[PDB]
Design a protein around this ligand. Structure first.
Ligand SMILES: CCCCCCCCOCCOCCOCCOCCO
Ligand SMILES: CCCCCCCCOCCOCCOCCOCCO
Ligand SMILES: CCCCCCCCOCCOCCOCCOCCO
Ligand SMILES: CCCCCCCCOCCOCCOCCOCCO
Ligand SMILES: CCCCCCCCOCCOCCOCCOCCO
Ligand SMILES: CCCCCCCCOCCOCCOCCOCCO
Lengths: 289, 289, 289
C-alpha cells in the first residue's frame, strides 16, 4: 500500500536588519510531501519505507527532489528503523515544545549540533554513505529511543566518529518528564550533549515547562529554557525565555499565538529576540493534507 | 487530501534543415505529473499546494525532478496564489487559441518575453528567489487576473525589476473578448506588452478569432494573428495566419487537425511555416490520466 | 488514472576484502517507487506512461530523482513502447533465473554489455537523447520481443551505432525455452550477443535449467550457467555453477535460500564465489507495496 501526506505553509518572515541591500521581510514558504510504502502481514509484523520531497523558498535550482530513504519493521510496540533515521535527541518529547510562530522556531531550542532525520538531499556529498539504525519502544505512557548513526558506513569504523544516542520520556495526565543523552553528537569527537525536561499541565488549558541542556562543544554552553502556553478556545498563547552560559549573551525570549482556523489549518505568528539581540517575527498559515 | 493527475504525449516532430549533422525528424515526447495537496474547511476556504514533475525528450541528465511550489487560498470565487504562480498574460483566455498539433504550438502565439508558471527547475540559479503573488476573480462569464512577480525577493525591491500584469476576459455563447497588459514583462525594464483578442463562435461547430499584440521590446514588433477552427464530428480542423512588424519577415501560417479518439485521448498533427520561413510539422498523441 | 507501487529491501552485504580501509560488510538497501499513468479507452486501446524513482545506498547527494519516461500503447496482446524501453535481451524469460539472495544477483547472469531499462538519471549526460522503440507480442505461452535503441536520436543515424534486439520464449507446464539475439549491443560496433536457455520443472516443487551465452566482445567469452531450485513449503533453495571461456577464470558458484514470510515479504540470503575468486554474501528482506 502507498500513502501520501504532507503540509504546506506560507507567510511573512521578518528579520531585523537582515543584511546590506537585503529585504528584511520576505515571503517564506515550504511544501512537504511524504511518500510512505507499507506492507502489513498476518503475523503482525509491518514493513515500511518512506521518502520525503520538500521544497523551501530560496532552494537552489528552484526544484524539488526526494531525500534518502528510511526503512522500518514494527512488531508489538517495537520499531527498528534503518537508513535515514530519526535520532533519540531529536525524537524525545518536550525538547521542542517552546517553538512558536508558523515556522515553528525558538531560540529556546537546544543550541547544539547533532544528527537528525535529513529532510533533503545534500549537495556537498557529506551524506552519501550516511546510515543509521534506530530502535523505539513504547510501553504505555513510556517511550524509549535508541539511535546509532555512522556518517560513512563504507569506511572502516575505527576511522570515523559514530553517534550514539539514548532517550526516554514519560507522561501521565498532568506531568511529563524527558531526558536524552548523546555521545559524539553530529559525528564530532567529544561533543557529548544531554537534555532533561519537565512539564506541568496546570489545567486542561495551560502548560508550563522547563528544559535544561548541556550543549557539549557548542559555544553556547549550558542552557535553560522556561516556556508556557495557554489555550483560550481556538487560540493558543505561547511564550518562552531562554538563557545560555556564553559570556555576554542576552536573554532570549519569544511571544506568539496560534489560531486553529479549522481541522488541519493553523494560523500562527510570533515575535522573538535572540541571544545576540537578533529581532525576528513571522505570521503565516500551515495547512495539512 | 492529495491528488495526482497528468498527461503523456509522444509523436514525430519534423524541423526542416534542423542543423548540420542533425536528424530533421525526431520522436518528441513529454510526461507531466501534477501533485496537488488540498485542505477544505467547513468555513468554505480551501487551501492548496501544487508541485509538477515534468520530463521532456532531451532533458539534461535523463532525469526528472519537481519544480518550485505554488500555494493558494480560495474563497467565494476569489483565489490568491503565492510562489510559482500563473501570471495574467499567460492565463487570459483566447491568447493561445491558434495553437495546433500534438505539441500545441503556433507562430501566431505572442512573440514577447514574459514570466509564466515555471514547469521545471532552472539549473542557472536564476529562479532561486523568484516569488510571485497572483489574484484571480471569476464573477460569471467574466474573469479578472492580476499578477505581481519579483524575480529575486530577498534583494531590496528598488534594485530589481518586478513584473506587474492585469488581464480580463468575457464570454457569452457566441462572442468572447480578452485583453491583457503587463509592465516590465519578464523583469526587463520598459518591456511593456499588451494583448487584445476577440472570437466569434459562428456555429456550434466553428470559431474564428483575431488576436493583436504589442510585443514590447521584442524585435517582432506588433503582431496580428487570425485563426479559425471547425469541428466535423470527432475531427477538428484548425488554421491560422500571423504577421509581425519586423522588417522582411514572412507571413507565418499553420494548418492542422485533431481527432478525438476517446475521452482523454487526442491524436493531432500540423504543418506550419514561420516568420523566417522555418518549416515544422508534427503528428502524435496526447493522453490524459 | 495514476497508480503507485514499489518495493523496499534492506540487509547485510558482505564482500570479502572489499578494499584498503573499507568495511567488508555494509547495510545495503534500495527503495523503488513506480508512478504509472494509464488511460483506458472503450475501443480497447490502453495508453500508459511510467516514471521510476529509485534510491540506493551510496547514491550521490543522498537524494532521489525520477528517471526518463517510458510510454506505451497496448491493443489485443500487442504493446508498442517508446522512450526508456525494456529491451529484448533484458526481457526474455529464463536469462536471470539463477539470481539469488536479497539483491537478486548471480555471477551466472550474462557477462556482456547491452542496453536495458534505465532505472535512474545519468549524471554523465550520456542518456540525454537516448530513445528506444520496443514491440512485444504475447500469443499464449509464446512471447515475442523486439527492441531498437538509438543512443542519441538527434544526430544523423549514420553517425551513431544503434542496438537491435530480438527474443522469444515459450513455455508449457514442464518445459520452457528461450532465445535472444542482439546486434551492436550497448551501442558498441560488432558486440553481437546471443542467448539460448532451457528449463525443466522436474516436479511442482523443483526446476533445473541451463543458459548458454555468446558474450560478444566481452573478455568473458562464451558462458554456460547451470542452475536449479527446490521449494520446501515456504522455503526455496537455489544453486548455480557458471563457467566462462576467459583464460584462467575460476568456476563461479552460488548457494542461497528464500523464505516467503508472508504475501509480499521475502527473506533471502546467498553465498557466492566469482570468476576471479571474489567471495560475496548477503542476507536481507524485500517487501512489496
Ligand atoms: C539526485 C537527486 C537530485 C539531487 C541532486 C541535486 C544535485 C545538485 O547539486 C549538483 C552539484 O552542484 C552543487 C549545488 O549547489 C547546492 C545545492 O543544494 C542546496 C540548496 O537546497
Ligand atoms: C512586516 C513585518 C511584520 C511581519 C511580522 C508579523 C508579525 C506579527 O505579529 C506576531 C504575533 O504577535 C502576536 C501575539 O501575542 C498576542 C496573542 O493574542 C492575539 C490573538 O489570538
Ligand atoms: C534539486 C532538484 C533537482 C534539480 C537539480 C538539478 C540540478 C542540475 O544542475 C546542476 C548544475 O549543473 C548544470 C546542468 O546543466 C543544465 C541542466 O538542466 C537543463 C535541461 O533540462
Ligand atoms: C517524417 C516527417 C513527417 C512527420 C510530420 C507529420 C506531418 C503529418 O501531417 C500533418 C498534419 O496535416 C494534416 C491536416 O489537414 C487536413 C485535415 O483533415 C484530415 C483528417 O481529419
Ligand atoms: C534533473 C533530475 C535530477 C537529476 C540531476 C542530478 C544531477 C546531478 O549531477 C550534476 C552534475 O554533477 C555530477 C554528479 O556526480 C554523479 C551523480 O550521480 C551518480 C550516483 O547516483
Ligand atoms: C557479516 C557477514 C555475514 C553477512 C552475510 C550473510 C550471509 C548469510 O548466509 C547466506 C545464506 O546461506 C544459506 C543457504 O543454504 C541453506 C538453506 O536452508 C536454510 C533455511 O531455509
Amino acid at each position: 500500500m502507498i500513502s501520501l501526506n504532507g503540509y504546506g505553509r506560507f507567510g511573512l518572515q521578518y528579520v531585523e536588519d537582515r543584511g546590506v541591500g537585503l529585504e528584511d521581510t520576505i515571503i517564506s514558504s515550504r511544501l512537504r510531501i511524504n511518500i510512505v510504502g507499507t506492507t502489513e502481514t498476518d503475523q503482525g509484523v509491518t514493513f515500511g519505507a518512506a521518502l520525503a520531497m520538500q521544497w523551501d523558498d530560496g532552494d537552489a535550482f528552484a526544484g524539488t527532489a526526494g531525500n534518502a530513504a528510511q526503512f522500518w519493521t514494527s512488531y508489538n510496540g517495537v520499531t527498528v528503523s534503518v537508513g535515514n533515521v530519526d535520532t533519540a535527541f531529536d525524537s524525545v518529547a518536550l525538547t521542542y515544545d517552546s517553538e512558536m510562530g508558523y515556522e515553528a522556531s525558538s531560540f529556546g531550542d537546544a543550541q547544539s549540533s547533532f544528527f537528525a532525520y535529513n529532510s533533503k538531499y545534500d549537495a556537498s556529498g557529506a551524506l552519501d554513505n550516511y546510515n543509521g539504525i534506530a530502535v523505539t519502544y513504547s510501553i504505555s505512557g513510556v517511550n524509549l529511543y535508541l539511535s546509532y548513526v555512522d556518517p560513512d558506513q563504507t569506511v572502516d569504523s575505527s576511522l570515523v566518529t559514530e553517534e550514539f544516542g539514548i532517550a526516554a520520556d514519560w507522561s501521565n495526565d498532568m506531568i511529563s518528564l524527558a531526558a536524552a543523552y548523546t555521545t559524539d553528537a553530529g559525528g564530532i569527537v567529544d561533543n557529548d550533549i544531554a537534555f532533561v525536561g519537565a512539564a506541568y499541565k496546570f489545567n486542561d488549558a495551560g502548560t508550563v515547562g522547563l528544559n535544561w541542556y548541556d550543549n557539549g562543544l557548542s559555544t553556547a554552553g549550558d542552557q535553560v529554557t522556561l516556556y508556557g502556553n495557554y489555550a483560550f478556545g481556538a487560540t493558543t498563547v505561547r511564550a518562552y525565555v531562554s538563557d545560555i552560559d556564553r559570556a555576554g549573551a542576552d536573554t532570549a525570549y519569544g511571544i506568539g499565538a496560534d489560531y486553529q482556523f479549522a481541522e488541519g489549518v493553523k494560523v500562527s505568528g510570533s515575535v522573538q529576540s535572540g541571544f545576540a539581540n537578533e529581532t525576528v517575527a513571522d505570521v503565516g498559515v500551515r495547512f495539512d493534507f
